[PDB]
């Protein structure tokens, strides 16, 4: 203990036929105060992995440094650091999962909920979750915080089980992710309009999109809504 | 401390083909101490049967209350109360004590004398009606009863087959509960005959 | 839980029930509450199941080391004190243990030590521990004699657990009987309480309150 | 108050109640009679919180005596026990409940049967061949379960009761200063002055 | 919640966001926080939604009965009725209400009734969780006797900032204009005010 | 801490520090033990090079380890006190935990174990 | 230990009226008490009420107001209005300061038109074109926010409503089983569509557990007298 | 305040046959009222013909299984590739669990396999390491729903032979692997109906002298 | 443990200690000896928390026996009581303190005087003509204050002790199952086997 | 406390009020909250006075030892040292620090380190209890590459409003200007800024 302070909200993600997509907004909240508006919560590791982090931002920055140090360390005395002995999404996740569970076991957790998204050496999609308790799980769609309640239902309508993954294109997957981010902006009071989105594809590699915005919003219907029951004017 | 598990006990009710069954254990205890092995939890008012689990003082009080009310009902209406009507009376009566409730889990069972339709219903301590087609469970081994009934039950069982199903549901549920057992009773109810059977079970 | 042990002319009788509960939920009816420390020593399980199992198996290891080093059977006094000194080190940490360490040696004769997780170590003739201990004490106290036969002593231990199994909601399942002699303990079977209750009711005429 | 025991035999009900009254540190009395005669053939013993025990018992006694005079008739033990249960069931949801547990030993002159009723402060009534309140049952019920017979004589009941009291005196930490024993039968209520 | 009422040359305008939260969940993103207690007496509500609705409904009843007997009530009278309910029941209420109205004799008037149930007549008032972030801005930018268009801009800019920083505020900016000409409702959408 | 290996093997397989400790024993006053059928007698030599000695208070050569066991020695007097103290502590420790006094063999095995330990521990002779 | 069920309840406005829908799971803690309860209730013939929270409080409050609405309708010789039910509900709930844990979606038609409100246990009310309540409200609202539009037809609104309920059924553990729907159109009778969808049918068991007769040990038999 | 524990739901079931053993578990992983995964394997082949599941708090469950698998590896290193018998594995798991007696693995562990006579074996553990060989054991969320059914249908409890009326018990005849699997499937189908945390999928690991085989079945997803 | 009494008369110290061992509900033993011989002419009785009482007593016993062997000399009662006080004073600021109260009855062979020391678990030592721990003093000290004389014989001390035990048996709520009485004098320690 | 740091064309300026309170008592009305950790690296302190002084003293030591070995540290390096102390000891510290410095290579830089011990590089930063009231004002009025005089006016106007509304802020407005030309201290008294 004691408490998360400056925090990031939902991280959402899903698998598709040739890879994975992950997204997270650019807000750092300070309670109900929307304090920091340019926080990047997707952190790429190499060209095959993107780690999405929610929760305490100070701990996120600590994890960000651990990953940076992991890349440095892997390159030491390693002629194949950019080839066969490069960091895999599975290596990066297992390392973080170890750290998270160790920290909770000392009663001094990193406060975060983490999603590691990537593509393995053999082209396999990697998508797994880990949090402050060291709890880990995998699913065709994964989301943290509010995303778990609102994004997953929408993303699961696209990929409801393992056999739906090969039938899902990157265009359909990205469309679903972007819509979910809009829904979260409507309904999560600790969300922002600005977000980042990353695609890790086994053919086209890592595509990192910054400064995206929620668009095509429906608000017009608000003009007709008056009072809270009996009021007509 | 928890009023609904001081005395212990269970009730289960099931529907069959042109019949209903309601059953209960016979234990009354003071927490770990067994006090009585003859504490029956099923009562009847005419052809309508009521099982009540929970705090034993309230079980007794509610039985006396519903005897009181169904007796006045009969004098005024000039007919015996039906299971559907009685269910509403139980619900009403429990909800009138919304902020000082009886700590009970009542179960109604019976056959409508005019339509011949089998009827069962359950309640929480505050009057919320559970009107299941298949079965109703109540008491300190309700989880165990849900497990037994869900696997053992099938619809349209004949009276003598329903007896075996409900008996085995009760017995094996009660044997996995410290505060239930010490004997058991099963009522098999048909439109104009009711049979009551006391079961043999382990006495620990 | 109901566990008892008593000294008599023919050694020690150890009798236990078999029920383990988690709240009102009966977790098991087949729990082994007598721990066979070694062929000569027995311990009873009450309080924490793990604490009793673990530390009384550990005790068996310490007893084995003792007799390897000293070339002599460990006394019940020494064996019980190894356990009580151990749990006393852990006092305050939250160990839960109420056990009877039972043995029969040359120098001591039949000996029982009540050992307990707050550090208590009591030598005695009759001990009864568990949620149903008061019921078993009643049958024990009114029927106990030093000059009981092995057969009658075994039945008394069996009947006393049955008394507890009947009345105590958290005792039952089956009865396990042991007879501890100088040459080692002898197991006297598992007895289902359900079957035993009716058998005893008929043969003894007891439990007239219950319809059979 | 502490130990109160009851046993219904062939032709009578026997109530045994401890004599000690302890106010914290000291035993203030060792001859206290924890019972009230409700009617000629009905006796009630009681135990619970100080003050409330006697206040409740005397309140019940006054009510049954009033009924007896109004109707020129003695209520059955069953009827008296039902009246008592209702009062305790009423009391448990009061502003300040009576913290009183009772045993009602009566001889029904109509049915020619002894009857023992056990009622706790919640209004939990049970008719029993033998009963107790508090920890008394924990020590005594295993003995009663073993030896009890429905056709026992009054003398055999007293002997089984002595065995129960002996077990209490052996294994109970508290000194309850012995018991006062009373017998309820067809001839009414009498006290066993040597026990 | 971000609410305000501003007097200007031709009368008074009430402004509000439309976000209602249960913790971090937005239960209603299109709430109408501008409520009518009389023809030209309105109020902005903050605090417990149940409490402020209950109070407003009672006030509307009181002013309807007042009107039947004594004719149109003053804005001061409406504020007094609000205060009476808020003050006398302060122990059981969480309500922060801004009362705004237009008379022909008195013109535009604003009264704020904070948590304690006190009354304060002001040229303009701000309230709700989002108001904290615009005390500086509003104090620097408010002028007396502004035009309708200036007052709309002032409220739009003020509530834009309150919404920007306060997570409990958001959605659309609703406004109600009270003048001799009548009652006009205005609405402004995120794509409009976020780029200010 | 001082960790120097004083007791070590020589090319011929001898530990000279242990063998030189025996030479210190050879210098010590003679001690003798004889066991009868129902007794044991410990005899000890007192060198008469020291007169004007106060025999009341001078350390006696035979020491009680417990009420039932005794220890005599030959060699360095100061060294013997350390072994005697350890033996006495162990005797009470044994009574405390086993609830029985030490056997003579056990007490011997303990003292012999302490002596051995000082032949392959660093920084001790 | 009173019933508080998991639920997904929704309300959707359309062209010529309003539709409400609900799942059919009633929970006791983690245990499913009723696998096919009816969460759609009547207040008046053309005003219906979906309820969540404390089950006893939702039913009790809906019946009490429904009773007073009927008497009010008879007294005024007029068909009852949704705003009357709304006002009576919220003033009742507010008086008890949230101790009556009733959370409702109210929906219906009346001479004034079609209406859709939500009521919260403490006595606050909201207006909307689409609303959701229950433990699966977030799952349902995600669907409503994704697919809702202005000028929905009858058939579109039923599809949207049931899709929102399905999101709750699959993704929320508190909700499950079937989908109930009630459609209230202007100028027509309200049509209650009990078990409109049944996508969670129990599969055939691998074995029959019908016991041989005589399996259960019996101590005593006796004929019970139900007659006078 | 930081709570180091959580509840991931799930239900597991171990049954020992005459010359086989099954360890089954649902594949659903949850927190509160949300589904984390519809397929997250919970029963694991640990080598040496031993299958294991640690149900409850999944982080502690994964840690324990991992440490046991590691213990099997080092047992081979230290003891000349000797096969770890099911009884030895059970005692080893006790020590792993009791090692954290004052900060326990919040799980209910069950292992299954064959004993050294080739007979089916199941061992059941509490969070702090107390264990027992058992014939039949359900663990986790719906254990209270399943065990009474198993008492009745595996051990024939409260069942007597018709005509005798309680005098002769129904004889305890041995069940085949096909018969056990039927009872496992019906246990989980029933548990899925009445318990909200049970569903999605059922994975069964069957152990015989030939090795470890897997079977998967769909469960309702509501 | 419950009642422990001590009285120093002309030529001896007499320690009386209850025989009951109660572990909550049941009296597990009624013949428990709550004392340890520290040296031939020094006896220590004890009462306090379960386990710690015996553990402390035996630990002290081992230490005094060790001193006796090392020096071939018996420590004075004063010296032993000071050693015991320091151990308890050390213990009270430990991680887990010994919850043990003791009486030390010794005969000083140098001064030819009996000596009684009362020490509580805090390390509060007092030399007294008579002493107790717990509630024992509340019932007995008024009798001792009245009857005690410094020139009493051992037999008179035992008679005054009997009066104290009788008052305890009358007014104490707990059944302590009588007392074991031991006498410490110039000839050592002996137990009065009929009391 | 009301503190801020603003980058501008020629470098950076730090601003602060001078009020230090113990409850409602003003323990020091002339506090200097602008502290020097290196020649042209300063910081503004908020939170526990004991904590922020202790941290600042340690940082000043670290940068003095850094300078002896490796030459002048960057503002980023100073912020990193602050963050290391604030993050690693987050459980035992209540410190909100704004770090401002001038390099010749990097020019004016501002880093804010809030309670949790995270770092945020910003064009300008505001902190302290009084900052809440000027989020709206500062966001509307800040421009990049302002002149020295404009930045002084921006800070003066901002902290004036923070002081006006926040009871925990007050006294004089202190400022420190960091440019290539050197280090300049400024002070502004109540009679000056209250009339703005
Ligand atoms: Mg049972
Ligand atoms: Mg039992
Ligand atoms: Mg906002
Ligand atoms: Mg399910």
mmCIF file of N, CA, C and O in Angstrom, chain A residues 159-217:
data_model
loop_
_atom_site.group_PDB
_atom_site.id
_atom_site.type_symbol
_atom_site.label_atom_id
_atom_site.label_comp_id
_atom_site.label_asym_id
_atom_site.label_seq_id
_atom_site.Cartn_x
_atom_site.Cartn_y
_atom_site.Cartn_z
ATOM 1 N N UNK A 159 -15.015 -11.047 -32.491
ATOM 2 C CA UNK A 159 -14.332 -12.319 -32.210
ATOM 3 C C UNK A 159 -14.854 -12.939 -30.908
ATOM 4 O O UNK A 159 -14.392 -12.618 -29.814
ATOM 5 N N UNK A 160 -15.826 -13.836 -31.049
ATOM 6 C CA UNK A 160 -16.502 -14.453 -29.907
ATOM 7 C C UNK A 160 -15.772 -15.702 -29.413
ATOM 8 O O UNK A 160 -15.902 -16.079 -28.248
ATOM 9 N N UNK A 161 -15.024 -16.351 -30.303
ATOM 10 C CA UNK A 161 -14.171 -17.477 -29.919
ATOM 11 C C UNK A 161 -12.937 -17.571 -30.821
ATOM 12 O O UNK A 161 -12.771 -16.765 -31.738
ATOM 13 N N UNK A 162 -12.083 -18.556 -30.552
ATOM 14 C CA UNK A 162 -10.812 -18.722 -31.271
ATOM 15 C C UNK A 162 -10.988 -18.843 -32.791
ATOM 16 O O UNK A 162 -10.193 -18.293 -33.553
ATOM 17 N N UNK A 163 -12.032 -19.550 -33.222
ATOM 18 C CA UNK A 163 -12.283 -19.782 -34.650
ATOM 19 C C UNK A 163 -12.715 -18.530 -35.427
ATOM 20 O O UNK A 163 -12.704 -18.538 -36.658
ATOM 21 N N UNK A 164 -13.107 -17.471 -34.719
ATOM 22 C CA UNK A 164 -13.464 -16.197 -35.359
ATOM 23 C C UNK A 164 -12.240 -15.352 -35.746
ATOM 24 O O UNK A 164 -12.361 -14.414 -36.533
ATOM 25 N N UNK A 165 -11.071 -15.685 -35.197
ATOM 26 C CA UNK A 165 -9.852 -14.890 -35.412
ATOM 27 C C UNK A 165 -9.392 -14.882 -36.878
ATOM 28 O O UNK A 165 -9.121 -13.812 -37.424
ATOM 29 N N UNK A 166 -9.301 -16.064 -37.524
ATOM 30 C CA UNK A 166 -8.910 -16.081 -38.943
ATOM 31 C C UNK A 166 -9.914 -15.399 -39.884
ATOM 32 O O UNK A 166 -9.543 -14.989 -40.983
ATOM 33 N N UNK A 167 -11.167 -15.283 -39.448
ATOM 34 C CA UNK A 167 -12.222 -14.636 -40.235
ATOM 35 C C UNK A 167 -12.250 -13.111 -40.070
ATOM 36 O O UNK A 167 -12.996 -12.425 -40.768
ATOM 37 N N UNK A 168 -11.441 -12.588 -39.150
ATOM 38 C CA UNK A 168 -11.448 -11.163 -38.827
ATOM 39 C C UNK A 168 -10.265 -10.451 -39.473
ATOM 40 O O UNK A 168 -9.113 -10.773 -39.191
ATOM 41 N N UNK A 169 -10.563 -9.479 -40.332
ATOM 42 C CA UNK A 169 -9.530 -8.681 -40.995
ATOM 43 C C UNK A 169 -9.087 -7.515 -40.113
ATOM 44 O O UNK A 169 -9.759 -7.165 -39.141
ATOM 45 N N UNK A 170 -7.954 -6.914 -40.468
ATOM 46 C CA UNK A 170 -7.398 -5.784 -39.716
ATOM 47 C C UNK A 170 -8.293 -4.541 -39.799
ATOM 48 O O UNK A 170 -8.318 -3.727 -38.877
ATOM 49 N N UNK A 171 -9.021 -4.402 -40.905
ATOM 50 C CA UNK A 171 -9.960 -3.291 -41.085
ATOM 51 C C UNK A 171 -11.174 -3.417 -40.166
ATOM 52 O O UNK A 171 -11.596 -2.436 -39.554
ATOM 53 N N UNK A 172 -11.732 -4.624 -40.081
ATOM 54 C CA UNK A 172 -12.862 -4.906 -39.188
ATOM 55 C C UNK A 172 -12.448 -4.783 -37.718
ATOM 56 O O UNK A 172 -13.205 -4.266 -36.896
ATOM 57 N N UNK A 173 -11.248 -5.261 -37.397
ATOM 58 C CA UNK A 173 -10.729 -5.206 -36.031
ATOM 59 C C UNK A 173 -10.473 -3.768 -35.578
ATOM 60 O O UNK A 173 -10.885 -3.374 -34.487
ATOM 61 N N UNK A 174 -9.797 -2.987 -36.418
ATOM 62 C CA UNK A 174 -9.514 -1.583 -36.104
ATOM 63 C C UNK A 174 -10.796 -0.762 -35.963
ATOM 64 O O UNK A 174 -10.897 0.092 -35.082
ATOM 65 N N UNK A 175 -11.758 -1.018 -36.848
ATOM 66 C CA UNK A 175 -13.078 -0.386 -36.788
ATOM 67 C C UNK A 175 -13.759 -0.646 -35.442
ATOM 68 O O UNK A 175 -14.320 0.269 -34.837
ATOM 69 N N UNK A 176 -13.705 -1.896 -34.989
ATOM 70 C CA UNK A 176 -14.310 -2.294 -33.719
ATOM 71 C C UNK A 176 -13.621 -1.616 -32.535
ATOM 72 O O UNK A 176 -14.286 -1.149 -31.608
ATOM 73 N N UNK A 177 -12.291 -1.573 -32.577
ATOM 74 C CA UNK A 177 -11.494 -0.919 -31.536
ATOM 75 C C UNK A 177 -11.822 0.572 -31.456
ATOM 76 O O UNK A 177 -12.038 1.105 -30.371
ATOM 77 N N UNK A 178 -11.867 1.236 -32.606
ATOM 78 C CA UNK A 178 -12.137 2.677 -32.661
ATOM 79 C C UNK A 178 -13.542 3.021 -32.153
ATOM 80 O O UNK A 178 -13.734 4.044 -31.489
ATOM 81 N N UNK A 179 -14.517 2.170 -32.471
ATOM 82 C CA UNK A 179 -15.883 2.348 -31.975
ATOM 83 C C UNK A 179 -15.946 2.191 -30.461
ATOM 84 O O UNK A 179 -16.627 2.959 -29.780
ATOM 85 N N UNK A 180 -15.236 1.193 -29.943
ATOM 86 C CA UNK A 180 -15.172 0.953 -28.502
ATOM 87 C C UNK A 180 -14.586 2.158 -27.766
ATOM 88 O O UNK A 180 -15.069 2.530 -26.699
ATOM 89 N N UNK A 181 -13.557 2.771 -28.346
ATOM 90 C CA UNK A 181 -12.947 3.970 -27.764
ATOM 91 C C UNK A 181 -13.930 5.143 -27.711
ATOM 92 O O UNK A 181 -13.889 5.942 -26.777
ATOM 93 N N UNK A 182 -14.802 5.243 -28.713
ATOM 94 C CA UNK A 182 -15.865 6.255 -28.719
ATOM 95 C C UNK A 182 -16.872 5.998 -27.597
ATOM 96 O O UNK A 182 -17.263 6.924 -26.882
ATOM 97 N N UNK A 183 -17.288 4.740 -27.458
ATOM 98 C CA UNK A 183 -18.241 4.341 -26.420
ATOM 99 C C UNK A 183 -17.677 4.640 -25.031
ATOM 100 O O UNK A 183 -18.382 5.153 -24.166
ATOM 101 N N UNK A 184 -16.401 4.323 -24.828
ATOM 102 C CA UNK A 184 -15.730 4.620 -23.562
ATOM 103 C C UNK A 184 -15.669 6.120 -23.283
ATOM 104 O O UNK A 184 -15.784 6.537 -22.134
ATOM 105 N N UNK A 185 -15.486 6.925 -24.328
ATOM 106 C CA UNK A 185 -15.477 8.380 -24.174
ATOM 107 C C UNK A 185 -16.855 8.922 -23.778
ATOM 108 O O UNK A 185 -16.948 9.881 -23.012
ATOM 109 N N UNK A 186 -17.914 8.310 -24.305
ATOM 110 C CA UNK A 186 -19.281 8.676 -23.930
ATOM 111 C C UNK A 186 -19.544 8.429 -22.446
ATOM 112 O O UNK A 186 -20.182 9.243 -21.776
ATOM 113 N N UNK A 187 -19.037 7.302 -21.949
ATOM 114 C CA UNK A 187 -19.519 6.704 -20.702
ATOM 115 C C UNK A 187 -18.526 6.645 -19.534
ATOM 116 O O UNK A 187 -18.945 6.495 -18.388
ATOM 117 N N UNK A 188 -17.229 6.760 -19.814
ATOM 118 C CA UNK A 188 -16.204 6.798 -18.762
ATOM 119 C C UNK A 188 -15.856 8.250 -18.434
ATOM 120 O O UNK A 188 -15.381 8.989 -19.296
ATOM 121 N N UNK A 189 -16.088 8.647 -17.184
ATOM 122 C CA UNK A 189 -15.824 10.017 -16.736
ATOM 123 C C UNK A 189 -14.335 10.334 -16.579
ATOM 124 O O UNK A 189 -13.972 11.494 -16.386
ATOM 125 N N UNK A 190 -13.479 9.315 -16.654
ATOM 126 C CA UNK A 190 -12.031 9.504 -16.544
ATOM 127 C C UNK A 190 -11.317 9.201 -17.860
ATOM 128 O O UNK A 190 -10.148 8.813 -17.862
ATOM 129 N N UNK A 191 -12.027 9.384 -18.973
ATOM 130 C CA UNK A 191 -11.476 9.155 -20.305
ATOM 131 C C UNK A 191 -11.276 10.479 -21.036
ATOM 132 O O UNK A 191 -11.823 11.510 -20.636
ATOM 133 N N UNK A 192 -10.485 10.440 -22.107
ATOM 134 C CA UNK A 192 -10.299 11.601 -22.972
ATOM 135 C C UNK A 192 -10.571 11.247 -24.427
ATOM 136 O O UNK A 192 -10.638 10.072 -24.799
ATOM 137 N N UNK A 193 -10.727 12.286 -25.238
ATOM 138 C CA UNK A 193 -11.014 12.143 -26.660
ATOM 139 C C UNK A 193 -9.783 11.685 -27.445
ATOM 140 O O UNK A 193 -9.909 10.998 -28.458
ATOM 141 N N UNK A 194 -8.601 12.070 -26.968
ATOM 142 C CA UNK A 194 -7.342 11.755 -27.640
ATOM 143 C C UNK A 194 -6.810 10.398 -27.217
ATOM 144 O O UNK A 194 -6.722 10.115 -26.022
ATOM 145 N N UNK A 195 -6.448 9.563 -28.191
ATOM 146 C CA UNK A 195 -5.877 8.251 -27.889
ATOM 147 C C UNK A 195 -4.821 7.796 -28.887
ATOM 148 O O UNK A 195 -4.663 8.380 -29.959
ATOM 149 N N UNK A 196 -4.088 6.757 -28.499
ATOM 150 C CA UNK A 196 -3.110 6.113 -29.364
ATOM 151 C C UNK A 196 -3.593 4.711 -29.703
ATOM 152 O O UNK A 196 -4.319 4.093 -28.925
ATOM 153 N N UNK A 197 -3.191 4.221 -30.870
ATOM 154 C CA UNK A 197 -3.567 2.888 -31.331
ATOM 155 C C UNK A 197 -2.363 2.242 -32.000
ATOM 156 O O UNK A 197 -1.670 2.884 -32.789
ATOM 157 N N UNK A 198 -2.116 0.975 -31.679
ATOM 158 C CA UNK A 198 -0.994 0.239 -32.247
ATOM 159 C C UNK A 198 -1.466 -1.067 -32.874
ATOM 160 O O UNK A 198 -2.275 -1.789 -32.289
ATOM 161 N N UNK A 199 -0.962 -1.353 -34.072
ATOM 162 C CA UNK A 199 -1.231 -2.608 -34.762
ATOM 163 C C UNK A 199 0.085 -3.358 -34.915
ATOM 164 O O UNK A 199 1.058 -2.799 -35.417
ATOM 165 N N UNK A 200 0.113 -4.615 -34.472
ATOM 166 C CA UNK A 200 1.267 -5.487 -34.683
ATOM 167 C C UNK A 200 0.843 -6.624 -35.610
ATOM 168 O O UNK A 200 0.084 -7.508 -35.214
ATOM 169 N N UNK A 201 1.340 -6.579 -36.845
ATOM 170 C CA UNK A 201 0.961 -7.522 -37.896
ATOM 171 C C UNK A 201 2.167 -8.365 -38.295
ATOM 172 O O UNK A 201 3.283 -7.853 -38.375
ATOM 173 N N UNK A 202 1.938 -9.650 -38.562
ATOM 174 C CA UNK A 202 3.025 -10.570 -38.919
ATOM 175 C C UNK A 202 3.626 -10.295 -40.304
ATOM 176 O O UNK A 202 4.733 -10.747 -40.598
ATOM 177 N N UNK A 203 2.897 -9.561 -41.144
ATOM 178 C CA UNK A 203 3.375 -9.190 -42.476
ATOM 179 C C UNK A 203 3.917 -7.762 -42.525
ATOM 180 O O UNK A 203 5.039 -7.538 -42.979
ATOM 181 N N UNK A 204 3.119 -6.805 -42.052
ATOM 182 C CA UNK A 204 3.462 -5.377 -42.146
ATOM 183 C C UNK A 204 4.136 -4.803 -40.889
ATOM 184 O O UNK A 204 4.465 -3.616 -40.849
ATOM 185 N N UNK A 205 4.343 -5.638 -39.874
ATOM 186 C CA UNK A 205 5.077 -5.234 -38.674
ATOM 187 C C UNK A 205 4.285 -4.354 -37.720
ATOM 188 O O UNK A 205 3.063 -4.481 -37.610
ATOM 189 N N UNK A 206 4.993 -3.461 -37.029
ATOM 190 C CA UNK A 206 4.394 -2.593 -36.015
ATOM 191 C C UNK A 206 4.008 -1.237 -36.603
ATOM 192 O O UNK A 206 4.865 -0.494 -37.077
ATOM 193 N N UNK A 207 2.714 -0.926 -36.561
ATOM 194 C CA UNK A 207 2.201 0.381 -36.976
ATOM 195 C C UNK A 207 1.675 1.132 -35.751
ATOM 196 O O UNK A 207 0.656 0.749 -35.174
ATOM 197 N N UNK A 208 2.371 2.199 -35.365
ATOM 198 C CA UNK A 208 2.023 2.964 -34.167
ATOM 199 C C UNK A 208 1.359 4.286 -34.544
ATOM 200 O O UNK A 208 1.993 5.156 -35.140
ATOM 201 N N UNK A 209 0.085 4.433 -34.186
ATOM 202 C CA UNK A 209 -0.693 5.627 -34.526
ATOM 203 C C UNK A 209 -0.910 6.529 -33.311
ATOM 204 O O UNK A 209 -1.544 6.125 -32.337
ATOM 205 N N UNK A 210 -0.381 7.751 -33.381
ATOM 206 C CA UNK A 210 -0.518 8.740 -32.311
ATOM 207 C C UNK A 210 -1.541 9.810 -32.679
ATOM 208 O O UNK A 210 -1.903 9.962 -33.843
ATOM 209 N N UNK A 211 -1.995 10.546 -31.666
ATOM 210 C CA UNK A 211 -2.881 11.703 -31.839
ATOM 211 C C UNK A 211 -4.203 11.405 -32.559
ATOM 212 O O UNK A 211 -4.731 12.257 -33.276
ATOM 213 N N UNK A 212 -4.733 10.200 -32.360
ATOM 214 C CA UNK A 212 -6.052 9.846 -32.886
ATOM 215 C C UNK A 212 -7.130 10.519 -32.042
ATOM 216 O O UNK A 212 -6.909 10.805 -30.865
ATOM 217 N N UNK A 213 -8.288 10.777 -32.648
ATOM 218 C CA UNK A 213 -9.419 11.390 -31.944
ATOM 219 C C UNK A 213 -10.719 10.626 -32.147
ATOM 220 O O UNK A 213 -10.956 10.050 -33.209
ATOM 221 N N UNK A 214 -11.562 10.646 -31.118
ATOM 222 C CA UNK A 214 -12.915 10.110 -31.214
ATOM 223 C C UNK A 214 -13.732 11.052 -32.094
ATOM 224 O O UNK A 214 -13.784 12.257 -31.839
ATOM 225 N N UNK A 215 -14.354 10.497 -33.129
ATOM 226 C CA UNK A 215 -15.130 11.280 -34.091
ATOM 227 C C UNK A 215 -16.466 10.600 -34.387
ATOM 228 O O UNK A 215 -16.736 9.512 -33.877
ATOM 229 N N UNK A 216 -17.295 11.253 -35.201
ATOM 230 C CA UNK A 216 -18.636 10.757 -35.546
ATOM 231 C C UNK A 216 -19.516 10.573 -34.310
ATOM 232 O O UNK A 216 -20.222 9.571 -34.177
ATOM 233 N N UNK A 217 -19.473 11.554 -33.412
ATOM 234 C CA UNK A 217 -20.199 11.473 -32.148
ATOM 235 C C UNK A 217 -21.645 11.935 -32.304
ATOM 236 O O UNK A 217 -21.920 12.918 -32.992
#
